[PDB]
Design a binder for this molecule. Structure first.
Ligand SMILES: CC(C)=CCC/C(C)=C/CC/C(C)=C/COP(=O)(O)C(Cl)(Cl)P(=O)(O)O
Ligand SMILES: [Mg+2]
Ligand SMILES: [Mg+2]
Length: 516
């Protein structure tokens, strides 16, 4: 049981303590949960139940029932159950916006002072109201000034009252929210955390809790078999024995679980995790290991998709390059075989673009150039690797793939570009880079520059949120990938890192949840 050991990882998937009795039980519990979501309940209680389903990682199992139940509730006119109740108003606002039902920010106007625009100080001791308002605020869009105020107000109040909470469970939840709001958290990681918290909630539904545990374990058995296959692949490539990129495979896979955790997306997940392992490896090639001439050759080979001069590179750079080449061809081929469309031109292209972006960073370094923040981000949203990961994910999942469709996603329209910019700046804040560039450009202090970059995180999120209520040429699951890579970034770049990481990996991928 060591997350970093490939003997152990390569064995993962041989045995599973998940039975076909477990699977039958799960089928029966799923049917009762489905009935609870669709069945009668008071509306607030129903919202709280649907929120709990989502938090336990189960929205993927019940999305239709959840949307149907919220639609019913949204079409009420009977509104006495929420109007003037901040907790109810805020929960409704969030779950409706999350599920594509618009609610205006002015539902919160009655809790403001009509003069100052400040929220009323009488809210300062409604903990659950403040919490729900804080969580809701992250569903806001650009220009929704009441929600911006709601963030700053609820953040300051929750910080003030955290230590005054009596309920240990509510206190843990508030602490958790102030670290990251729910909207920014990675689904699968939050699910493992929330199962334990939910078990201790007073309103806890034991049927739902039991289903959540069992489903978690069943899903986890697919992940273990994936990890097995990926670790055997990775050891097959020899790249585990490289100087650099210690733990790159399992780091990549843990990030991939943030992007997409569902069992039916297992083959796509494995291919994203391969690409990710290669991104982090090759990034080290370009950042730490290769000479400028070696990197120029690596980039030119990739740009031409032509490995004739590959032997000019030393072994430790030639191996990563050929593995990138072979895996890119494998993934494009999968698209041909499974989806009807040869994806090799698109995997080659995004790798070429990414190495070009690495090459530009290496040239800035070598020549002592200080880019502006905009100049840096234009390149760095590519170098972070998410255009590569996201275009690949689209290739593998879009229905009826065409050159026209792949060309559009590969051109990085705003929705996609927002995601890539976020992943880059979140990574940079988690510590050349965003903050220092903005410092160089404006003379700001570190503190002020960091606040600026944090503001950019909030702004790009608002743009993501809004892009989600508008019609898109994109569908599920790509729509979810695009959000969930950002949540993955937040989760792994909060500011011992080793033991926190290992604990997440062990608790989410390695140890099952004990069932009585
Ligand atoms: C969703 C998915 C499968 C992610 C795979 C892992 C990937 C490639 C994460 C990109 C973010 C990572 C792990 C960056 C760490 O690398 P760094 O060298 O610090 C850099 Cl931030 Cl890339 P940079 O080289 O710009 O300094
Ligand atoms: Mg690097
Ligand atoms: Mg780099």
């Amino acid at each position: 049981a060591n997350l970093w050991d490939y003997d152990f990882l390569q064995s993962l998937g041989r045995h599973s303590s998940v039975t076909e009795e477990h699977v039958g039980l799960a089928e029966k519990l799923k049917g009762e949960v489905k009935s609870l979501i669709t069945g009668p309940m008071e509306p607030l209680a129903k919202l709280e139940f649907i929120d709990s389903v989502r938090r336990l990682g189960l929205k993927y199992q019940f999305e239709t029932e959840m949307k149907e139940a919220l639609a019913n509730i949204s079409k009420d006119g009977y509104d006495s159950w929420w109007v003037d109740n901040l907790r109810a108003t805020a929960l409704r606002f969030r779950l409706l916006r999350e599920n594509g039902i618009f609610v205006p920010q002015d539902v919160f106007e009655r809790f403001q002072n009509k003069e100052t625009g400040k929220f009323k100080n009488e809210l300062c001791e409604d903990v659950k109201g403040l919490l729900n308002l804080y969580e809701a605020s992250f569903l806001g869009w650009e220009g929704e000034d009441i929600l911006d105020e709601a963030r700053t107000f609820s953040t300051a109040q929750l910080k003030n009252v955290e230590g005054k909470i009596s309920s240990p469970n509510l206190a843990k939840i508030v602490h958790h929210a102030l670290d990251l709001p729910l909207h920014w958290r990675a689904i699968r990681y939050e699910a493992r955390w929330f199962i334990d918290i939910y078990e201790d909630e007073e309103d806890m539904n034991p049927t739902l809790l039991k289903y959540a545990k069992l489903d978690f374990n069943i899903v986890q058995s697919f992940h273990q078999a994936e990890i097995g296959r990926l670790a055997r692949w990775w050891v097959g490539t020899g790249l585990d024995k490289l100087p650099f990129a210690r733990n790159g495979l399992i780091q990549s896979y843990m990030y991939a679980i943030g992007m997409l955790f569902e069992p039916h997306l297992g083959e796509v997940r494995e291919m994203e995790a391969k690409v990710g392992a290669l991104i982090t490896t090759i990034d080290d090639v370009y950042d730490v290991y290769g000479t400028m001439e070696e990197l120029e050759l690596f980039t030119d080979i990739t740009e031409r998709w032509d490995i004739n001069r590959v032997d000019q590179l030393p072994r430790n750079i030639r191996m990563p390059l050929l593995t990138m080449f072979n895996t890119s061809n494998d993934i494009g081929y999968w698209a041909l075989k499974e989806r009807g469309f040869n994806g090799i031109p698109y995997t080659a292209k995004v790798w070429a673009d990414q190495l070009k972006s690495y090459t530009k960073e290496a040239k800035w370094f070598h020549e002592g150039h200080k880019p502006t923040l905009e100049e840096y981000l234009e390149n760095a949203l590519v170098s972070i690797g998410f255009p590569n990961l996201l275009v690949t994910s689209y290739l593998l999942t879009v229905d009826n793939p065409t050159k026209e469709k792949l060309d559009y996603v590969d051109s990085l329209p705003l929705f996609v570009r927002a995601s890539c910019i976020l992943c880059r700046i979140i990574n940079d804040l988690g510590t050349l880079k965003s903050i220092q560039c903005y410092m160089n450009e404006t003379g700001a202090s570190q503190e002020v520059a960091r606040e600026h970059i944090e503001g950019l995180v909030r702004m790009w999120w608002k743009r993501l949120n809004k892009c989600l209520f508008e019609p898109s040429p994109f569908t599920e699951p790509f729509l979810s990938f695009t959000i969930n890579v950002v949540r993955g970034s937040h989760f792994f770049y909060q500011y011992n890192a080793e033991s926190w990481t290992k604990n997440q990996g062990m608790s989410v991928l390695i140890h099952p949840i004990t069932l009585d």
